Design a protein around this nucleic acid. Sequence first.
RNA 1: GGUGAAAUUCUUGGAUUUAUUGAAGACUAACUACUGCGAAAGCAUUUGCCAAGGACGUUUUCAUUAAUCAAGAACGAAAGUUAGGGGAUCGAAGAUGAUCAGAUACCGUCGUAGUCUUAACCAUAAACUAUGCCGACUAGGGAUCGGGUGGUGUUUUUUUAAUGACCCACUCGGCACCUUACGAGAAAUCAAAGUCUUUGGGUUCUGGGGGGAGUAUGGUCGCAAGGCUGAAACUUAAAGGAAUUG
Lengths: 93, 25, 88, 81, 97, 116, 129, 150, 91
Amino acid sequence: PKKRASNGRNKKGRGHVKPVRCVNCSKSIPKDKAIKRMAIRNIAVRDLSEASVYPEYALPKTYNKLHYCVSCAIHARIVRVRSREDRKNRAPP
Amino acid sequence: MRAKWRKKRTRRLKRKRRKVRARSK
Amino acid sequence: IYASFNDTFVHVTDLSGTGGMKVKADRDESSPYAAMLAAQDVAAKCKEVGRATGGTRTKTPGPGGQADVTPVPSDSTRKKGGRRGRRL
Amino acid sequence: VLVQDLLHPTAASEARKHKLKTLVQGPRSYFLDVKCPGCLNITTVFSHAQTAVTCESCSTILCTPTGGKAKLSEGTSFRRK
Amino acid sequence: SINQKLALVIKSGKYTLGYKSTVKSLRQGKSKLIIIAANTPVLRKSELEYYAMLSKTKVYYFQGGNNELGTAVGKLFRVGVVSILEAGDSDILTTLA
Amino acid sequence: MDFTTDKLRSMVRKWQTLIEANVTVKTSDDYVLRIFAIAFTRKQANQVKRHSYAQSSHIRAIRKVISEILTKEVQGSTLAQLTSKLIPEVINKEIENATKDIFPLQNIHVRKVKLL
Amino acid sequence: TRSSVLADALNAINNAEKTGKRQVLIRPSSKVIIKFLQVMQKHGYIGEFEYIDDHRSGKIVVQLNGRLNKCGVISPRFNVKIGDIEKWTANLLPARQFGYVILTTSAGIMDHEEARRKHVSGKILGFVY
Amino acid sequence: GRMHSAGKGISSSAIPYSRNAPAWFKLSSESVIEQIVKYARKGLTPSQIGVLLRDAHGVTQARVITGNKIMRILKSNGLAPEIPEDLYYLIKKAVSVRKHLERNRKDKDAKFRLILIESRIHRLARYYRTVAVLPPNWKYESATASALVN
Amino acid sequence: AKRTKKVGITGKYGVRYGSSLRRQVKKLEIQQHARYDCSFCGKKTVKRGAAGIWTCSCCKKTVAGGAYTVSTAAAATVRSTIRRLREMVEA
RNA sequence: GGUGAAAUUCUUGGAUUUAUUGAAGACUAACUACUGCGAAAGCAUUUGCCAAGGACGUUUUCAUUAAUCAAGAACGAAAGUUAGGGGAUCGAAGAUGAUCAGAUACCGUCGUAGUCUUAACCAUAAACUAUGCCGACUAGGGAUCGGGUGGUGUUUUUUUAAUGACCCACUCGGCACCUUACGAGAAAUCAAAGUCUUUGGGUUCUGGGGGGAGUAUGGUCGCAAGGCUGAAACUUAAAGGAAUUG
Ligand SMILES: [Mg+2]
Ligand SMILES: [Mg+2]
Ligand SMILES: [Mg+2]
Ligand SMILES: [Mg+2]
Ligand SMILES: [Mg+2]
Ligand SMILES: [Mg+2]
Ligand SMILES: [Mg+2]
Ligand SMILES: [Mg+2]
Ligand SMILES: [Mg+2]
Ligand SMILES: [Mg+2]
Ligand SMILES: [Mg+2]
Ligand SMILES: [Mg+2]
Ligand SMILES: [Mg+2]
Ligand SMILES: [Mg+2]
Ligand SMILES: [Mg+2]
Ligand SMILES: [Mg+2]
Ligand SMILES: [Mg+2]
Ligand SMILES: [Mg+2]
Ligand SMILES: [Mg+2]
Ligand SMILES: [Mg+2]
Ligand SMILES: [Mg+2]
Ligand SMILES: [Mg+2]
Ligand SMILES: [Mg+2]
Ligand SMILES: [Mg+2]
Ligand SMILES: [Mg+2]
Ligand SMILES: [Mg+2]
Ligand SMILES: [Zn+2]
Ligand SMILES: [Zn+2]
Ligand SMILES: [Zn+2]
């Protein structure tokens, strides 16, 4: 039987959603059902600035959206498979 | 065997049976 | 500077316009200990006279990078691996 | 709520409800005699014109069509009777 | 459009279709406008425009062949030229045309 | 010119709608150039809607006027006075003076230029 | 479309009964509706109703009590020969003690027991118990 | 509802309880029936007449100053159009989608809605035919119709 | 009554040379025989002969064209892009 | 270079890299959401044109003109087929390098068709909500999309409005979610899957143990691949569903 009433993710009343392809393995996955994680980490960080011009002017970072297909979301990234009633909680943390 | 491979196995079968008696067409 | 996975690149030139060489076991080409080891002789020639692979797939810094001009598309040029991806 | 007068409900409860879902249906739309004080005898308009009306003698414009807020251009009086 | 504004002179005003009637209309001064299909040849065109200048009639070059100009005027035949003879209530003589 | 990876990717927050518009335009100066432009939506700062979206009579009417005022200073100059014109950048809200009558529209910049 | 207009009133009452609630407005109050609410009050399963007059097809409010388990409309409006009224009562009435199966006869809408009194018959309308 | 969709959105008009005149309206019957026929000969649908008389003038609804409905006055003054106003529009639509189809010949969508429009026409006509307001021979066709609007 | 389900004009070849060869011949046959619309006078009076030669019945004009149609796809896409580069050399 | 690691591979031809720069075809990133639209398939840069549509508003018009539907017809992802063009990408086939006892594979490499487009076909998907359509009734809850009504609400300050966006309340019609359970169910769960043994609102369609088998046969559609229609002999006591414990 069903073991999610959403039974994909996040698509009610649309019929078809363009697919994205997974960062890890390139497998195709419907955009609505790709677990999305935005990775923003920045560019050892004071050695950077002492021996350098512009005395800490800007400090910019990576900005990048990530899409994994369940299979590879499950392998490493944030899936951490939940229990039967623990999984309906869509609180991010 | 998988369902859709039994489909393939049968589609093949009938294309072969279809052939065999157009011999006696 | 440009960082693959299983390589990192570094090269001086005029504003107008180093990899898996100091290490050779060829799994180590990415490794930071060799990014450094070949960054060393790079700043050397820097003073001796005076980017992720991206494009399509993984859009992300490599290991030997730290030890942006990343090419990103307008969502075209379908990626290798088919629709079932690399399978293990 | 398991005892509730259907026949005599509050004149405010039915003020909230829909044009058609009152007890006896009725249009919540009125008419207005609009005075543009540059002419003597002026006209009786309907609340959602959708015809930007013009009056007898002048080329006036009074109204504008809308979603129903039949906007009474430059300022004038009226009466909902 | 202007097909709109032209389509009003058929049901309202006086007109005449065709090359030959159109030029006795340009000789007797009766035409204040004539509309000329796209494809009608240039020799004929510059002739009409001569007759127009002599009647001091204005012209309008209709983007669209005489096939189109005819189904514009509501007729089911090609019309190489029209000549309005009364602009019954169309502003065509008073629009930018 | 260009923007830089840091700033552009710093600007595209989810929970709002991006807007881009370009036009290819002359100068005195016999030059014809494709500008770019970029704007987003501000939550009016009394507002509870988490997602701060316009409804696309707006996005159509906005580039409608962005390009009206974008080709209303370039060919309103040489390239020289052009470089002189975008460096104080106050064209950036020479869009906004138009758009304050339509939408909140934070983070309006011009964000590239690209030529022949 | 609403087809057996009677039903859409009748069922609301049944819903309106183990609602607990003891009024219900019904739509749209045909002549056959009133002469059905009437026969029920004649035997005490509802109290008083009021024909609201919209200049439309009508509205009733029936104030109801809790004596009634099942009123119901039975139809395609089957035809019942005088000899087989008792086959319906049997099928759809709890006991031979109480409950009526209302119906339509030439002598007017009337419960099944009055029909055995009047010796007339017709088509079956519904039932109340 | 929405016979050719699955959109169940109700919006009627609320016709008021008062079937008599609005009791603030000065002109009566004759005064303004005479008004509607000036626009019938102007060329307006009984709805354009009903609306223009609703707002620019005091006429809240035909039925109750008159007491024949609007089309029922034009019919007596001989101004009833060739065919009922609604179907006229349905055809004017069907022709207006067709000329767009026959020039954008690769539009699967409009072809679908021509079908819908046309089969709505055929059921309305089928009604008008059986109530004698259209001859029993009456039907509609792509090429007969393009000159039936104008 | 409808005379042939499939072959139309290509029945003259009868049974010979194969369905496929006949089918394809039918295609261009139908093109090279039909009357086309004249661009200069508006009448459907341009017919072929001597393939690549197209002539109006009245108004007597002759246009070079495709071997079975007046305009080939190629020709038209040249027309379009020749306008294109021409509109590029006065403004 | 490529992977877990390697190898087939590319480099006196200055490869990988940089720089300026042009070509071709494909795609619309980020913004993108429990958000929108369409009958469904499906639809995401710009602008102009072309017709079209729901909801709302409506003291406008018609006045039963409707609901659902064998036959019949329109559309119908992907692949696939015919005729051109296109052929950058990725890539059934095929060939390879590796792994394996073997390895036609999974992983790597080359790459045909294909991928795109026009003209014509084909008519199938777990084409899915595994859940017919119209009407009605039965229950709490805050979001949100479109329309609308209500204001000595806040903001733009220009000099205050007009406006625009925002706030609040209600009401229609949407996409959903939440809490309950009166109620339902074999259960999982369901505001319907409820208002059924207290069994009848209207109507369409399919199913009747498991295999045999969507096979045989005929008919019919297709260029084909195949689509629709669609048995039986025989065989068998289970097969199946949901939930529980291991
Ligand atoms: Mg399972
Ligand atoms: Mg999905
Ligand atoms: Mg689907
Ligand atoms: Mg043989
Ligand atoms: Mg490849
Ligand atoms: Mg695995
Ligand atoms: Mg007897
Ligand atoms: Mg229907
Ligand atoms: Mg309804
Ligand atoms: Mg409406
Ligand atoms: Mg985009
Ligand atoms: Mg038959
Ligand atoms: Mg290729
Ligand atoms: Mg192989
Ligand atoms: Mg091998
Ligand atoms: Mg093989
Ligand atoms: Mg293995
Ligand atoms: Mg199927
Ligand atoms: Mg599904
Ligand atoms: Mg549901
Ligand atoms: Mg099943
Ligand atoms: Mg609710
Ligand atoms: Mg709601
Ligand atoms: Mg329970
Ligand atoms: Mg229970
Ligand atoms: Mg055959
Ligand atoms: Zn993956
Ligand atoms: Zn006026
Ligand atoms: Zn000619």
